[PDB]
Design a protein around this ligand. Structure first.
Ligand code: PIO
Ligand code: PIO
Ligand code: A1LX7
Ligand code: CLR
Ligand code: CLR
Ligand code: CLR
Ligand code: CLR
Ligand code: CLR
Ligand code: CLR
Ligand code: CLR
Ligand code: CLR
Ligand code: CLR
Ligand code: CLR
Ligand code: CLR
Ligand code: CLR
Ligand code: CLR
Ligand code: CLR
Ligand code: CLR
Ligand code: CLR
Ligand code: 41U
Ligand code: 41U
Ligand code: CL
Ligand code: CL
Ligand code: NA
Ligand code: NA
Ligand code: NA
Ligand code: NA
Lengths: 565, 565
């Protein structure tokens, strides 16, 4: 029974949680969601939502970890009925990791496509990009007017290299005929998973330095990019369009849901990564300051990434003689299409391409590292046999992720990636964070967690924190869940409609998770010896307090536990 | 540490080894291989080969089990360097099981297609069979002459129901585009794996009664079939063609290899099933009588199945006014095409169809049961944690087999089935039995095994048995391996050529096995503490004798061990 591991320094934990919080969603989703939702008028609700969805929950997780010093699965020693919930989130993270690795591979491919004087996305002619031959001309070299949407036009050299050069989507038609995995993407995925294994194979020692590097790099990259972009012609128009405050859209009821989803999927609240990272800190560490600093750093990073991206977009629109809304897009398509074009247009395309691709690689690597570390920590604290042998279990996890990401990098693997991401991430992690909030706030109690924090840190959390823990956060999570359930639309690509069975498979994965949580609750209720009341007491009370279950002193049965605010 | 399990009676073990020995290869491959290779002139070498490939090896396995009372993996306590060999065979069996389950499902489908007054294979018109519409007429109702081969003609109602009604091969083009698994085949596979799990979930208690039933049924089915067939017109010509002795072909050098492969793949010598079944017998049980009776029963069953099948073929050729060689075929296509046609032609098609399909179902079930029981016994004797919890491990094995058989029952799953069967079975099990023979006969010794048998049974094996164990069987296995390696041809279906990468994947699986055996030998050589000679001694000597490794008394180092015959 070796003692629990600890970080070398708290700066390592801070950089780890920052790298987990900072993601490509801050780069490709926050700017577009901000500009589309009235610019600055998007921020006024966003930060507000951010505040709640950032301050208690994150804090809670950290505090929870600092009080439990265990993984996301075994953290439910105060309420075993929700322990399976942790299991779910682990699988959830695992699921995410799969397609996330795919994204990383893409960046790595572009990295291997960045060492040349004539980049593939510059011109046409089978220059490392499969020529569709259906008018693969220069982007807008001949004519002045871009009639259709720039992102919708699929005959630009950047888009041709994206969907044909690396993805090879032309060789597939959908999820019914996906084909075989590509070999160069296979090698890129091999390199990615090998780096991840060599980073996470030995506790939290080397991973600290790795997240140090992958945190120090992207901020410098963004700084250099914005410094070079503010001097570019036309970037001022893009920046002004990004910060244009139009308070009219706030009542549209769509600027709130988008901001809530963006904050929830960017900050990482409710995920096992936070508990896993907090399970290695000191017992007297201040989780409040750490959570606040992480949220502030995440928001500032999102804002500066939006500034830089929209400066680049304004420069490109000036070069393309079009409006900012035409070039405005979001996602992997957005980056991999528009950024290489502006880089090739700028002087020294090699340096900018290399630095942008290495920033994306570092971000993806640190995010997948945090997710896989959470998975490993949870499954190790759950089964002590896995905690002893960490290298072999890490190798097995990396190999399973590699096999499933190979399944997902096929000719039609973008459809499987979208399906997994949308269905699994949204539904599963929403239900998981809702169950976790309900368990920690109501079933366990909001005063016991405050007393635990008072034991860890000298000051006791105020009334606002408890009220947001018990009422505001659960209601917000339930609202987001109901919105995601009602607003569900059939899966659709750019121009490809998904057959009905793909949506049913996605909902089947989501239902697998949200019955495995009840499957575990039923297993716990049945595997206990006693009557209805005694089984319920053993299920809703902490294990270390199970003795008072026999003493007829259950606090949850009384009503003072429920109304403790 | 619960004691080792034992059979309720030795009749259970006998029926189990008979059911494992009796397979559909005796039904669809032995008759065609016999008739094609000069009829009775096929038997003269066959039985001879049979004798060797049946008498010592089988016996050896049984005796080995009776001396070890463990699985196929852990049976190498006398030579740990070959223990990984056992691992291989386990995986090999597992591999086989996958596609084997597919075959079982097929029969089950035909079973669910046997309860009707107008059977699907009788007539055309979308009668439970997908009509290709390219002249799907009556078989030979209009015309008298069958120009092309009857089995090659793909527009007969039986063939239309086979390749389109259940397999749905028209909806696929090869292994590159396989598609999604079919739902009715999915349900049939579910039923099959559920029956297998309910049979093998509790030791060797219920499996005894299950193999009792699945042994008592097929012999009665074959008896009724032959009794009804000897009275049919034209069956005498088919029987005479089957038993026509033409000693001219014996020098063609092809009637020997086919007989050797048929015996080796029908008797099951070198597989883990024999060791697993012998690991539950009494220490004083006679393995010689059991092996001899099993070989004789297998040969007689093959002969009577050939008699009945060729009587049916002669009757059908009389009904079709063609020669016996035209209707003569082999395999799942042979049975599922020709037998339903003759059954529909006969009176009371329902009874004959039901009894034939239930015989095929029983055979497939008992064979897959033996294979999965071998796998479970090996992996349980290897890891004691799995021997304790047998139900959960059996469920996991059945679920993995179910998932891979679902992968193999897709629209193009027949190609994957052929690939797996040919490559995996042939190459892997040939290398495995060669390594096992070399280990038990040369590295361990042929006199020590004889002394072990003398300890188990009063009489000591004669000189012929030891000479066949040490020289004849290893040379025969090496000959078969060399023939299989040299005569390797690219994978080809009826009319579909396989792309090169399918053959490379098959050879990659075979190489995975035949390096995992050296991978284990290298792991054993490296994980030992000592110099070259001490490591080699600890690797080539029994564990219970490892003490004399320190006493410098290794017998294998001397030459008297090698020439002990
Ligand atoms: C289906 C299978 C397909 C692929 C099969 C792949 C086979 C497989 O399982 O490998 C995964 C991984 C191997 O790791 P790896 O390939 O990197 O091999 C070395 C080994 O792990 C050493 O222990 C390391 O020394 P140390 O730790 O720094 O002192 C050395 O690191 P370094 O010095 O060069 O930097 C490593 O190079 O697992 C284990 O660790 C086994 C040892 C168990 C515990 C190790 C004892 C610490
Ligand atoms: C990914 C998962 C997807 C599917 C998950 C599928 C769920 C799963 O995990 O299955 C595993 C396996 C399935 O078998 P099954 O569920 O049928 O077993 C049940 C029960 O657990 C008893 O083991 C059975 O024997 P008994 O009659 O009571 O004696 C009883 O049989 P019966 O009542 O029908 O006759 C059954 O009710 O369950 C175990 O056996 C655990 C060992 C417990 C040992 C208890 C006895 C030794
Ligand atoms: C990466 C996959 C993520 C999920 C991992 C779950 C593994 C698991 O096994 O869960 C079993 C659980 C009850 O069994 P356990 O909870 O594990 O038993 C516990 C144990 O023995 C621990 O060692 C001790 O500390 C706990 O006290 C036991 O309860 O049943 C369930 O909810 C269905 C979950 C099955 C998951 C299958 C995936 C579809
Ligand atoms: C239990 C967990 C860890 C196993 C992994 C589940 C995931 C990775 C598996 C389960 C079901 C699988 C999907 C089932 C449906 C299809 C159809 C095929 O045409 C495209 C691949 C695709 C989309 C599969 C991709 C991988 C998949 C989503
Ligand atoms: C020009 C392109 C490649 C960007 C270069 C980024 C790399 C080279 C820079 C960016 C930020 C840098 C980090 C920022 C500051 C520190 C803190 C110091 O205590 C250790 C080194 C470390 C961690 C630096 C390492 C090198 C670093 C990661
Ligand atoms: C690197 C330059 C060009 C861009 C500026 C990026 C800023 C926001 C980032 C990048 C590197 C980061 C520094 C690297 C690591 C350390 C050491 C430790 O004590 C924490 C603060 C400090 C000093 C970080 C502060 C924030 C930091 C300076
Ligand atoms: C939204 C973009 C601009 C980044 C967000 C920056 C703003 C919104 C963030 C950064 C620093 C944050 C503050 C940090 C400190 C505190 C004190 C705490 O007791 C309540 C929350 C509060 C008041 C935070 C509110 C939100 C905050 C002001
Ligand atoms: C492709 C994937 C599935 C690889 C398989 C995962 C393997 C490598 C992982 C998963 C679980 C791990 C095991 C969990 C615990 C133990 C018990 C210990 O006494 C021996 C090591 C062993 C057995 C670990 C070895 C490695 C292991 C088997
Ligand atoms: C490896 C990837 C796919 C995720 C891991 C899958 C999980 C659910 C499975 C796969 C292998 C399993 C482990 C294999 C080995 C052991 C040792 C045993 O004494 C306790 C259970 C335990 C610890 C299992 C727990 C659950 C386990 C970790
Ligand atoms: C571990 C995860 C992958 C569990 C996966 C369960 C999913 C992949 C499986 C289980 C049951 C399956 C469903 C059962 C039957 C139908 C009806 C038909 O309309 C096809 C889709 C649909 C709805 C299947 C889709 C795939 C499905 C939902
Ligand atoms: C409690 C746990 C087990 C699961 C609870 C989640 C519930 C709310 C899930 C389970 C099944 C899900 C449904 C499955 C599929 C569909 C059909 C689709 O056209 C609209 C969404 C809808 C209707 C989903 C809505 C959300 C849903 C009803
Ligand atoms: C290690 C063991 C247990 C894993 C199982 C191996 C088998 C079942 C797997 C591994 C490699 C797989 C094959 C390799 C790729 C293809 C090509 C595709 O067009 C059809 C499926 C097919 C033919 C796969 C079928 C299933 C397969 C043969
Ligand atoms: C369905 C039809 C066609 C097949 C009939 C099944 C017959 C052949 C099989 C099934 C079960 C078998 C019986 C199972 C058990 C016993 C008890 C034993 O003391 C004598 C043999 C006897 C009686 C077996 C004889 C053969 C048997 C009756
Ligand atoms: C099923 C019958 C009528 C058709 C002919 C098949 C015969 C030869 C098969 C089928 C069932 C078999 C019998 C069923 C089981 C037993 C009980 C055992 O203690 C002695 C062998 C004996 C008696 C078997 C002998 C061979 C057997 C009789
Ligand atoms: C008809 C064919 C297909 C089946 C083969 C049956 C014959 C060839 C087999 C079955 C039973 C066998 C015999 C069974 C018992 C013995 C021991 C002794 O007496 C000499 C050889 C001898 C070892 C075997 C010779 C070969 C044998 C006669
Ligand atoms: C491969 C997939 C599809 C099937 C699932 C495999 C499962 C069912 C099998 C494989 C290995 C088995 C485990 C190995 C040994 C142990 C240790 C014990 O303390 C709990 C039971 C447990 C954990 C077994 C439970 C069932 C188990 C996990
Ligand atoms: C489930 C089927 C496919 C078996 C094939 C996979 C085999 C090789 C794997 C899967 C699950 C694994 C087992 C999972 C659990 C344990 C418990 C641990 O303390 C010893 C190793 C042991 C026993 C593993 C041994 C190897 C194992 C059985
Ligand atoms: C199935 C498991 C047990 C192991 C299987 C290994 C197989 C599936 C893998 C491993 C390495 C792979 C090979 C690697 C190299 C090439 C190059 C290409 O020009 C033909 C395909 C081919 C030959 C691949 C075919 C599939 C392959 C052989
Ligand atoms: C000892 C273990 C590791 C494996 C034994 C090596 C032998 C038996 C294996 C390893 C590589 C295999 C070869 C791989 C693929 C080919 C090319 C094909 O066109 C003919 C068969 C042939 C030539 C295979 C023959 C069998 C083979 C030579
Ligand atoms: C929140 N910033 C990291 C984003 C988070 O990263 C993960 C990456 C890999 C594995 C697990 C991850 O988390 C569980 C995520 C979650 C859901 C969808 C996409 C991305
Ligand atoms: C020998 N009479 C049984 C045949 C044998 O049956 C098995 C079936 C399922 C799993 C394992 C099997 O054995 C390992 C086999 C072996 C190789 C290829 C096909 C068939
Ligand atoms: Cl953000
Ligand atoms: Cl035979
Ligand atoms: Na983020
Ligand atoms: Na990141
Ligand atoms: Na046989
Ligand atoms: Na059989």
């Amino acid at each position: 029974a070796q003692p629990r591991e600890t970080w070398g320094k708290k700066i390592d934990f801070l950089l780890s949680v920052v790298g987990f919080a900072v993601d490509l969603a801050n780069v490709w989703r926050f700017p577009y969601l901000c500009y589309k939702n009235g610019g600055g008028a998007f921020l006024i609700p966003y930060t507000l939502f951010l505040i709640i969805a950032g301050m208690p929950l994150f804090y809670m997780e950290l505090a929870l970890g600092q009080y439990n010093r265990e993984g996301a699965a075994t953290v439910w020693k105060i309420c075993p009925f929700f322990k399976g919930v942790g299991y779910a989130v682990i699988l959830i993270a695992l699921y995410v990791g799969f397609y996330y690795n795919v994204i990383i591979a893409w960046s790595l491919y572009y990295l291997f496509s960045s060492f040349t004087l004539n980049l593939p996305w510059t011109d046409c002619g089978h220059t490392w990009n499969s020529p569709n031959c259906t008018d693969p001309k220069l982007l807008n070299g001949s004519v002045l007017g871009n009639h259709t949407k720039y992102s919708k036009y699929k005959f630009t050299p950047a888009a041709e290299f994206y969907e044909r050069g690396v993805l090879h989507l032309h060789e597939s038609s959908g999820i019914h005929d996906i084909g075989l995995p590509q070999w160069q993407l296979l090698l890129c995925l091999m390199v990615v998973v090998i780096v991840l294994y060599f980073s996470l194979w030995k506790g939290v020692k080397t991973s600290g330095k790795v997240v140090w590097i992958t945190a120090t790099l992207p901020y410098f990259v963004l700084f250099v990019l914005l410094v070079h972009g503010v001097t570019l012609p036309g970037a001022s128009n893009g920046i002004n369009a990004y910060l244009h405050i139009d308070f009219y859209r706030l009542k549209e009821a769509t600027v709130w849901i988008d901001a809530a989803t963006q904050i929830f999927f960017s900050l990482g609240a409710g995920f096992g990564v936070l508990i896993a990272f907090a399970s290695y800190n000191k017992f007297d560490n201040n989780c409040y300051r750490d959570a606040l600093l992480t949220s502030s750093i995440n928001c500032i990073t999102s804002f500066v990434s939006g500034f830089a991206i929209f400066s680049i977009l304004g420069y490109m629109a000036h070069e393309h003689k079009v409006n900012i809304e035409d070039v405005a897009t979001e996602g992997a398509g957005l980056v991999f299409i528009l950024y290489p074009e502006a880089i090739s247009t700028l002087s020294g395309s090699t340096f900018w391409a290399v630095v942008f691709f290495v920033m994306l690689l570092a971000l993806g690597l640190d995010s997948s590292m945090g997710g896989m570390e959470a998975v490993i920590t949870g499954l190790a604290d759950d089964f002590q046999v896995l905690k002893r042998h960490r290298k072999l279990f890490t190798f097995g996890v990396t190999f399973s992720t590699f096999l499933l990401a190979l399944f997902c990098i096929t000719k039609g693997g973008i459809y499987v990636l979208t399906l997994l991401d949308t269905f699994a991430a949204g539904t599963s992690i929403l239900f998981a964070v809702l169950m976790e909030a309900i368990g920690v706030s109501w079933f366990y109690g909001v005063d016991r967690f405050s007393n635990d924090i008072q034991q860890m840190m000298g000051f006791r959390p105020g009334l606002y924190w408890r009220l947001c823990w018990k009422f505001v956060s659960p209601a917000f999570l339930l609202f987001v869940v109901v919105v995601s359930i009602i607003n569900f639309k059939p899966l659709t690509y750019d121009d490809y409609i998904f057959p009905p069975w793909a949506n049913w498979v996605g909902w089947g994965i989501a239902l697998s998770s949200m019955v495995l949580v009840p499957i575990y609750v039923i297993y716990k209720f049945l595997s206990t010896q006693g009557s209805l009341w005694e089984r319920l007491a053993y299920g809703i009370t902490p294990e270390n307090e199970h003795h008072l279950v026999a003493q007829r002193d259950i606090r949850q049965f009384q009503l003072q536990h429920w109304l403790a605010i």
